[PDB]
Amino acid sequence: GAMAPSYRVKRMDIAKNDEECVVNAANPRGLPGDGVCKAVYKKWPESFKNSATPVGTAKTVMCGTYPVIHAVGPNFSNYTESEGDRELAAAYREVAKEVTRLGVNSVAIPLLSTGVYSGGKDRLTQSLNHLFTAMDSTDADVVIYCRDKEWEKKISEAIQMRT
Numbered sequence: 211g212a213m214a215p216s217y218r219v220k221r222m223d224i225a226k227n228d229e230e231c232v233v234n235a236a237n238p239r240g241l242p243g244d245g246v247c248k249a250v251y252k253k254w255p256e257s258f259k260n261s262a263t264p265v266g267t268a269k270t271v272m273c274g275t276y277p278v279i280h281a282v283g284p285n286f287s288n289y290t291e292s293e294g295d296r297e298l299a300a301a302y303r304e305v306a307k308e309v310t311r312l313g314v315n316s317v318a319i320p321l322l323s324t325g326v327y328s329g330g331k332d333r334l335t336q337s338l339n340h341l342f343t344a345m346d347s348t349d350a351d352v353v354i355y356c357r358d359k360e361w362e363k364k365i366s367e368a369i370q371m372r373t
């Protein structure tokens with residue numbers, strides 16, 4: 211465990227993380243994809259061997275000894291708001307189980323279903339609150355990665371609110 215388990219946010223490429231493992235915002239088929247998934251494919255392509263897994267699940271594949279946790283959020287273009295919310299919550303619960311099983315002291319994590327799976331909606335709060343629900347009972351240092359300056363400020367404020 212971390213000595214004083216924390217949440218932090220950084221506005222940078224998750225492929226350049228400084229944590230002991232990474233969560234990929236994966237597609238169900240283990241394809242290179244776009245956005246976070248394509249950056250992860252370029253950095254850790256060996257981790258895409260048999261990485262296909264259903265929506266609402268996470269599957270870890272090693273790149274050398276570096277764990278890549280493939281977490282499959284729902285595409286809100288295809289799911290109802292209700293079913294999509296349930297699968298997004300479930301994907302983060304499966305990430306918490308994998309982080310625990312691996313025994314890592316830190317994890318790099320993107321906000322699932324906030325990009326091309328967002329169905330065109332701002333899901334910062336929705337996705338972050340499900341991340342907290344899952345990861346609060348873990349003792350890994352969690353470092354959340356984003357690309358937008360306004361998102362960085364809002365994620366930082368949400369972390370500070372609970373402090």
Ligand SMILES: [Cl-]
Pocket residue numbers: 221222223226
């Ligand atoms: Cl960067």
Ligand SMILES: [Cl-]
Pocket residue numbers: 235322323324325326327328
């Ligand atoms: Cl996404």
Ligand SMILES: [Cl-]
Pocket residue numbers: 356357358361
């Ligand atoms: Cl972002």
